[PDB]
């Protein structure tokens, strides 16, 4: 049940430093407490790793970069818990401000490895409506059937290679459509875990 | 490609809560839960569907649709629902 | 129309209010004709 985005596994550009399972490991980021008042989160594609382990050394100390990903979200929820998530990968996710000041803060366009909570998830923070977000690659997390969502994303960009600290290809959004609910005497914060695994990564332009 | 319908489009209901149909406990049997016309291209719950928008970029259309429903309650919660479709000729049925 | 066939039964310690999410699409026989501008 791994949603292979656009039906394309990430591949090596035919014939650059091609790392291996040392960098192609499973980075398990911090968990995020899913509450009822929760609105959502989003992580940029390579910005979520630019300061985490070996991938943070291969990205900053280089000039060109391309790689897929293996985003994998899991929710350690009970059986008396109810709710639903929409886990979608948005290519070229461009964040927009909200004028009653015109341009998004840098903390909101490159949140790091912690993600930025949505301020208006109904409009995906990008003007476009959340109702049509399913046109992107996505997978539902419905606590009554399954609590896992794996998305395989290739490298989607115009140029073959591009910068890794400036241009963030996509953004993994996680939005609760049906809010969390539970009777008294339960874990009031369902944890959400995210695992990343760069697939077929490449690099160029050392130092 | 399936997208969400704002079936709960109602005066006052704001935010993402317009995409949710409330199914509660003390709703006695044979009562009505929700209803929405099948018109992808007229102002209504279909106006938030990829079909409901593209069909507004054209003049005429004809085909078959589909409405996948999804329950988002607890795993222990059980019950049963009746989902009926009425052709264009008749009107909305009055009783279960 | 969506009718309440039965009631909504739950065991103890379980929320008594859920949600239904509807998703719409078009089958493989859909057709379009006479492209024109929109009304936003």
């Amino acid at each position, epitope marked *: 049940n791994i949603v292979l985005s656009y039906g394309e596994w990430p591949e090596y550009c035919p014939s650059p430093t091609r790392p291996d399972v040392s960098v192609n490991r499973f980075y398990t980021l911090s968990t995020k407490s899913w509450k*009822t*008042e*929760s609105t959502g989160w989003y992580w940029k594609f390579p910005d979520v790793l630019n300061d985490t382990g070996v991938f943070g050394q291969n990205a900053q100390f280089h000039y060109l970069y391309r790689s897929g990903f293996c985003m994998h979200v899991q929710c350690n929820a009970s059986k008396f818990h109810q709710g639903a998530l929409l886990v979608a990968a948005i290519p070229e996710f461009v964040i927009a401000a909200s004028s009653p000041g015109l341009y998004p803060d840098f903390a909101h366009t490159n949140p790091g490895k912690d993600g930025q909570e949505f301020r208006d998830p109904y409009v995906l923070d990008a003007g476009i409506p959340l109702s049509q977000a399913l046109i992107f690659p996505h997978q539902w997390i419905n606590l009554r059937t399954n609590n896992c969502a794996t998305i395989i994303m290739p490298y989607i960009n115009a140029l073959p290679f591009d910068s890794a600290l400036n241009h963030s290809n996509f953004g993994l959004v996680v939005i609760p459509i049906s809010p969390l609910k539970y009777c*008294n005497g339960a874990t009031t914060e369902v944890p959400i875990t995210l695992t990343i695994a760069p697939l077929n990564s490449e690099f160029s332009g050392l130092r | 490609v399936e997208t969400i319908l704002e079936v709960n489009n109602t005066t006052g209901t704001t935010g993402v809560s317009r995409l949710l149909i409330p199914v509660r406990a003390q709703n006695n049997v044979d009562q009505l839960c929700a209803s929405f016309q099948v018109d992808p291209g007229r102002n209504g719950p279909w106006q938030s569907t990829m079909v409901g928008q593209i069909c507004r970029y054209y003049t005429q259309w004809s085909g078959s649709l589909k409405v996948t429903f999804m329950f988002t309650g607890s795993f222990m919660a059980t019950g049963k629902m009746l989902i009926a479709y009425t052709p264009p000729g008749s009107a909305q049925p009055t009783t279960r | 129309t969506i009718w309440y066939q039965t009631n909504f039964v739950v065991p103890p310690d379980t929320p008594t209010e859920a949600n239904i999410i509807a998703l719409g699409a078009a089958q493989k026989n859909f057709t379009l004709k006479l492209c024109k501008d929109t009304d936003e």
Partner: nanobody
Amino acid sequence: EVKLVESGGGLVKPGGSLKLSCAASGFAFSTYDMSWVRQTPEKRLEWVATISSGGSYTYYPDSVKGRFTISRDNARNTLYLQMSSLRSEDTALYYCARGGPYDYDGSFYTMDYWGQGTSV
């Protein structure tokens, strides 16, 4: 049952602070969005303030809009409401109940169960 109880009110000089407690139990006080309603001496219930279901969002009507400061313990099962420099015509039986514009699966328990109401 949804047992809510308000307490912590009384007389105070115009200009100061006087909090209010709405410690409630018998229901999950971690998912419901509560709010505060004031019953003036003219027997006209007016909205005072609200709080989200996790104590992060807040809508302040034109009654205070900068003076009253609501909160939510959410662990000691209590609800706070500040009265920073209350006005002259601000005496009322400040009730507390459920209901909130947040918590998407709302609009059902909109002030369903109420408290008791403490005077000022």
